[PDB]
Amino acid sequence: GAMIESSTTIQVISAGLPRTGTKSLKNALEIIYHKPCYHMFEIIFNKQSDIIKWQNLIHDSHMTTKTIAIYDKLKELLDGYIATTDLPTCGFYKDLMNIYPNAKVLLTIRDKYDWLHSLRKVVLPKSNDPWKLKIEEGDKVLGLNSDFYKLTEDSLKFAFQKDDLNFDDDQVLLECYDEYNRLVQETVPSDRLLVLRLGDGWEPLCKFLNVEIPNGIDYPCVNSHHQMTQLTEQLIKYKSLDAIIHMFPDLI
Numbered sequence: 001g002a003m004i005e006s007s008t009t010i011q012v013i014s015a016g017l018p019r020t021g022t023k024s025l026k027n028a029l030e031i032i033y034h035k036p037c038y039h040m041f042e043i044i045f046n047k048q049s050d051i052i053k054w055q056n057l058i059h060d061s062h063m064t065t066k067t068i069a070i071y072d073k074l075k076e077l078l079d080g081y082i083a084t085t086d087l088p089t090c091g092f093y094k095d096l097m098n099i100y101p102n103a104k105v106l107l108t109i110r111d112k113y114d115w116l117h118s119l120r121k122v123v124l125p126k127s128n129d130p131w132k133l134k135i136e137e138g139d140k141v142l143g144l145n146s147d148f149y150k151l152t153e154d155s156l157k158f159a160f161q162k163d164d165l166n167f168d169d170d171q172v173l174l175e176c177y178d179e180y181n182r183l184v185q186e187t188v189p190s191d192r193l194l195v196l197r198l199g200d201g202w203e204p205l206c207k208f209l210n211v212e213i214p215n216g217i218d219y220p221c222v223n224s225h226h227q228m229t230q231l232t233e234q235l236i237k238y239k240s241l242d243a244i245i246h247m248f249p250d251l252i
């Protein structure tokens with residue numbers, strides 16, 4: 001196809017929850033658009049100063065005049081990006097649709113038990129799981145503190161529309177996952193929504209976005225819980241990111 005000059009603004013809003021292929025989708029959108037896509041890894045690795053900003057925005061999110069200040073801060077946080085994925089953004093999908101009326105919406109989904117298992121290995125181990133201590137030890141190497149965990153918790157509560165949440169309760173998390181995915185599909189006009197399942201690859205995505213399939217580039221497969229376990233163990237072993245980063249090429 002011909003090469004055209006794409007606008008550096010949010011063109012794709014992905015409402016998918018963490019551990020549904022968000023990092024592979026981020027990578028895929030960056031391959032298509034050649035500009036950055038937001039993700040929790042953007043915060044962790046490039047913009048830890050954004051943590052307090054997302055926390056403030058969530059704090060005010062329950063609240064039109066008030067909306068304009070909030071929408072202005074969302075636009076500010078996303079300046080220079082061509083798409084959003086992952087927490088903390090995904091709970092804001094309805095507001096992002098208003099701010100970027102010409103953006104299209106994605107929802108990444110998967111088997112709920114595979115999702116929960118992945119979530120418990122990477123994002124939200126149970127309180128009494130010994131792996132939680134290793135996760136926390138590796139995170140300190142990256143400069144992540146209790147405010148990072150607060151942002152994860154609060155952005156999940158915001159996405160699930162809950163005042164509080166028993167994070168150690170699998171049944172609660174599974175119900176919230178199903179309800180969240182059902183609500184996205186009931187909210188977004190079908191013309192504006194593409195549901196992606198793990199394994200779908202390039203073709204439905206590129207058709208929805210009116211772009212060619214990237215020539216000679218396989219659809220990304222990154223950020224498996226096995227890979228995250230290795231990342232945590234290697235951070236613990238070497239005590240820095242820069243000592244190990246060459247071992248995690250497309251994930252980091």
Ligand SMILES: Nc1ncnc2c1ncn2[C@@H]1O[C@H](COP(=O)(O)O)[C@@H](OP(=O)(O)O)[C@H]1O
Nearest residue numbers: 018019020021022023024118220221223224225
């Ligand atoms: N192209 C692909 N095909 C199959 N699974 C993929 C994939 N890309 C990512 N995944 C899976 O999506 C999960 C990561 O999602 P996210 O990037 O949103 O955290 C991981 O699940 P597992 O933890 O079950 O391996 C990973 O294996």
Ligand SMILES: O=[N+]([O-])c1cc(N[C@@H]2CCN(Cc3ccccc3)C2)ccc1CO
Nearest residue numbers: 018040041044086087122123135139152228
């Ligand atoms: O809020 N999330 O959804 C969310 C939270 C985390 N936190 C986890 C807890 C343990 N630590 C492991 C690690 C994962 C990746 C990079 C470095 C370290 C971070 C990670 C991802 C997401 C979504 O991509």
